[PDB]
């Protein structure tokens, strides 16, 4: 009864006779030892998705029921290890003796099981932490053209979580084995592997594994949240996850819709991204943040899969391929990038200075595009055109260089209040390094007060302590 016989095999899909008592979504075992999911239950046959190399499967082979819904191992044992989408090890460091297993498909927490998000997840990047705040429980999308730094923002985030009790998961979907190895070595060089789990389904792995990968990584992150701990998850590219589902759906002969993707494609990503949440105090107060990544062809942010994920997340960080070749980093387009959780998750000292900056850096784009020349505009327009240039310089920041929140507050207070208006634009970057080293070397009382109080009480000391640096042979 719990045994069937294969009737047809193809490019990762099979059909079998028998398996009468099989249940929708159950794991099934082939005589070769490979496994598959029972998706469709018909009058006389079962449709199976194979989770490995199918070239060893033939018609007439005996298939068997496992008696279990698709599940993955979870626990403390996965920290500092590399595994595939099925949770099996690929680092060569031996077996995993995990004590608990969890289904990869689960409903998200309800409206009452949640609570508002208020504790800031610092990224270390001045444009994100000021203009596009992130908090524990939020879902922020990283979007831009190929070769623009999307993986660098995710890896810089998984490293700034050094002196915090946050557990990081990185899910590689459709990536090259060489890029997976470069990410793992970068994490070991910075020590992030002491608190990280890596899940991989590379470009050469079957599309069925590239489909299960984000769900398996989510189940591992939920374990920490369900026990009151904090976790973070990265999805290296949801654009490749969608292509893998389009392949499986077209091979099952489901009718296509927009851009040949299946009608089910919204439910695919929305069922995964709504499991990221901050739970209520009765549930334990735990959290799970998400950082999905997407790739735009020629900057077409308006495409189906990109706008579809933007409609699910709590904010967007858009990266420009045009600004990147103009010597600008992180190259975030503030005129399009925004967050729905923003302002509330950020600390009070930062709310007091960053509040009006995004809308100012949006109208700045219009003015520089509209102003035909520099000699015909009036004094009222010249004054606001210059401010945006200086703020744009302050927002520039190199790779592998996290800046702490207390230092970000002092420099943004200087720019948003006009202290940089006499300094030339080419000297603004020298000012930022010289000013931060001056305050840390002889006024640690400003940075220490912001670190303990999280708010600006009296600015009088900072105005005078700042003016002293200006009088003392500034740039």
């Amino acid at each position: 009864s719990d045994v069937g016989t294969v009737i047809q095999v193809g490019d990762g899909i099979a059909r079998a006779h028998g398996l009468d008592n099989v249940m929708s979504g159950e794991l099934v075992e082939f005589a070769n030892g490979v496994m598959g999911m029972a998706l469709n239950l018909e009058e006389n046959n079962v449709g199976i998705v194979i989770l490995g190399p199918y070239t060893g499967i033939k018609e007439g082979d005996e298939v068997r029921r496992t008696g279990r819904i698709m599940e993955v191992p979870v626990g403390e044992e996965l920290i500092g290890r590399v595994v595939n989408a099925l949770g099996q090890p690929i680092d060569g460091k031996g077996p995993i003796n995990a004590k608990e297993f969890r289904p990869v498909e689960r409903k998200a927490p309800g409206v009452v099981d949640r609570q508002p998000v208020k504790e800031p997840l610092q990224t270390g990047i001045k444009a994100i932490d000021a203009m596009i705040p992130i908090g524990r429980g939020q879902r922020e999308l990283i979007i831009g053209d190929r070769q623009t730094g999307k993986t660098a923002i995710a890896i810089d985030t998984i490293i700034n979580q050094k002196g915090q009790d946050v557990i990081c998961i990185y899910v590689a979907i459709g990536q090259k084995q060489s890029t997976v190895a470069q990410v793992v070595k970068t994490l070991e060089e910075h020590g992030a592997m002491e608190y990280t789990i890596v899940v991989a389904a590379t470009a050469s792995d079957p599309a069925a594994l590239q489909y299960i990968a984000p769900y398996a990584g989510c189940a591992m992150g939920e374990y920490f949240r369900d026990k009151g701990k904090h976790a973070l998850v990265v999805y290296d590219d949801l654009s490749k996850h969608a292509v893998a589902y389009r392949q499986i759906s077209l091979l099952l002969r489901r009718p296509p819709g927009r851009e040949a993707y299946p009608g089910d494609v919204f439910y695919l990503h929305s069922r995964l991204l709504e499991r990221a949440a901050k739970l209520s105090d009765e549930k334990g107060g735990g959290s799970l943040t998400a950082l999905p990544i997407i790739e735009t062809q020629a900057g077409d942010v308006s495409a189906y899969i990109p706008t579809n994920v933007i409609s699910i997340t709590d904010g967007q960080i858009y990266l420009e391929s045009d600004l990147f070749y103009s010597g600008i980093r992180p190259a975030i387009n503030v005129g399009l990038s925004v967050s729905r959780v923003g302002g509330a998750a950020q600390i009070k000292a930062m709310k007091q200075v960053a509040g009006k900056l995004r809308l100012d850096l949006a109208q700045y784009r219009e003015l520089q595009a509209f102003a035909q020349f520099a000699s015909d505009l009036d004094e009222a327009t010249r004054a606001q055109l210059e401010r945006g240039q200086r703020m744009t310089e302050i927002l520039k920041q190199p790779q592998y260089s996290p800046m702490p929140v207390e230092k970000q507050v002092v420099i943004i207070y200087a720019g948003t209040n006009g202290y940089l208006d006499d300094i030339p634009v080419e000297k603004v970057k020298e000012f930022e390094d010289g000013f931060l080293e001056y305050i840390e070397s002889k006024h640690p009382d400003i940075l220490e007060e912001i670190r303990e109080k999280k708010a600006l009480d009296d600015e009088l000391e900072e105005k005078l302590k700042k003016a002293i640096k200006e009088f003392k042979a500034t740039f």
Partner: protein, 468 residues
């Protein structure tokens, strides 16, 4: 009367019954099974009958996940459609698509249960009231006035501001009328739904409000029937109690896509862009029930997601025929920092007639739409030739259109986290007086930057003083 599961294909399940004991269309069926051994899983599931196929077989749509189902499982017929509680006991409660409570508050114990499918009011029961609902939002109150008892639709792509605009309307209208309120949240975010529930529970407004949700993560059966559960609860206050009510729906596009996902599995031929052949009929089954009659009134604010920013898509296209007012949100305005980002040239309402609004209101709105269209017709000429080559009249028209497009911007109370400003409410008199004063050229010697993010005209003038 019982039957058995014959097939399972994602959200769709086929069931076979006994000789002549077949259930009617839209009828609810129940699956209650306890695991007999360790290889099975416990299941509690509701199915809705969609069509008759022959061989004593019926095709159905599942309301929750079909994971764990096995061919041969026993199914029971309830004898009627999905039935939900109705009455004053439902006020201040949160509900699931099946009318079961989400909140930890206990059983509702209402006196009657109504079926989710009911015929709409006939032509002789319709109303023809022409009363202006003041919102306090400077762009809607001028260019697209909201009729009492009519439908107002918010159209926009991803992240343009539909939810921020709905929540500012909820705050401003539900404050002074003190009538019964309903919010459906068909595609509403669980995080936003939680932020809404906490504010309403602390402000006391929850005691007059019904909530139904039906989250993004749910299967299509729930995303398809949830808009009808909230509407069936709002209909009771109109029909049996004679009251005036507000019905909010954050997403009716999700209701259309849930029908599209279902259609291929039912065995139907697809139409344009892969949609179901029944799209206009299904939208009319929902929209014809949302009307004011001689017994009472239903006023509704709805948000419509526009996929890939294309308004020609079958779902947004089918919806425009049903609305009394239509607001379209533009990315070009949002990317430029102008919020709420409502497009002045595509937004309109039934009420914008010389017979329903004052001569001064009609003339100011006419002059605003015209100056913005003239400015839209010149951005090519200003790109090819220098601005010093345009005539004095066109030069003034550009400066006035520039001031007007940003004087249409306003800081909302529900947006203090994003705007960094307190929040403002503007009365109709100050909106009309404001635009007239700019159109007539009294404010030509004032910078464009002074008109951005100010509620009223007197504020723009002190904002100019705050800058030498």
């Amino acid at each position: 009367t019982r039957g058995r599961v014959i097939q399972v294909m994602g959200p769709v399940v086929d069931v076979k019954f006994e000789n002549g004991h077949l259930p009617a269309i839209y009828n609810a069926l129940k699956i209650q099974h306890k695991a007999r051994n360790e290889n099975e899983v416990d299941i509690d599931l509701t199915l809705e009958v969609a069509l008759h196929l022959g061989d004593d077989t019926v095709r159905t749509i599942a309301m929750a996940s079909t994971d764990g189902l096995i061919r041969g499982m026993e199914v029971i017929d309830t004898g009627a459609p999905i039935s939900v509680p109705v009455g004053p006991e439902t006020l201040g409660r949160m509900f699931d698509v099946l009318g079961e409570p989400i909140d930890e508050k206990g059983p509702v114990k209402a006196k009657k249960r109504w079926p989710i499918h009911r015929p709409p009011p006939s032509l002789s029961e319709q109303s023809t009231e022409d009363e202006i609902l003041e919102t306090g939002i400077k762009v809607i109150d001028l260019l697209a006035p909201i009729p009492k008892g009519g439908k107002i639709g918010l159209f926009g792509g991803a992240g343009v501001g539909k939810t921020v605009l709905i929540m500012e309307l909820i705050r401003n209208i539900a404050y002074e009328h003190k009538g019964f309120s309903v919010f459906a949240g068909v595609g509403e975010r669980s995080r936003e739904g939680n932020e809404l529930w906490l504010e309403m529970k602390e402000s006391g407004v929850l005691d007059n409000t019904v909530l139904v949700f039906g989250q993004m993560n749910e299967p299509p059966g729930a995303r398809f029937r949830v808009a009808l559960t909230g509407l069936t609860m709002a209909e009771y206050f109109r029909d049996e109690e004679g009251k005036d009510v507000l019905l909010f729906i954050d997403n009716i596009f999700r209701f259309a896509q849930a029908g599209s996902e279902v259609s291929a599995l039912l065995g139907r031929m697809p139409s344009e862009v892969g949609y179901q052949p029944t799209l206009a009929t299904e939208m009319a089954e929902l929209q014809e029930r949302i009307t004011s009659t001689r017994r009472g009134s239903i006023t509704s604010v709805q948000a419509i997601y526009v996929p890939a920013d294309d308004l020609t898509d079958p779902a947004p296209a089918t919806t425009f025929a049903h609305l009394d007012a239509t607001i379209v949100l533009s990315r070009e305005l949002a990317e430029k920092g102008i919020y709420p980002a409502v497009d002045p040239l595509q937004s309109t309402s039934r009420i914008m007639d010389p017979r329903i609004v004052s001569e001064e209101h009609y003339e100011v709105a006419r002059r605003v739409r015209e100056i913005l269209q003239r400015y839209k017709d010149l951005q090519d000429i200003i790109a090819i030739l220098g601005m010093e080559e345009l005539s004095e009249e066109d030069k003034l028209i550009v400066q006035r259109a520039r001031k007007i497009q940003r004087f249409l911007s306003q800081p909302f109370h529900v947006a203090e986290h994003f705007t960094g400003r307190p929040g403002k409410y503007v009365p109709i008199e100050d909106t009309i007086r404001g635009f007239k004063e700019i159109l007539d050229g009294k404010l030509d010697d004032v910078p464009e930057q002074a008109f951005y993010m100010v509620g009223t005209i007197e504020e723009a003038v002190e904002k100019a003083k705050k800058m030498k």
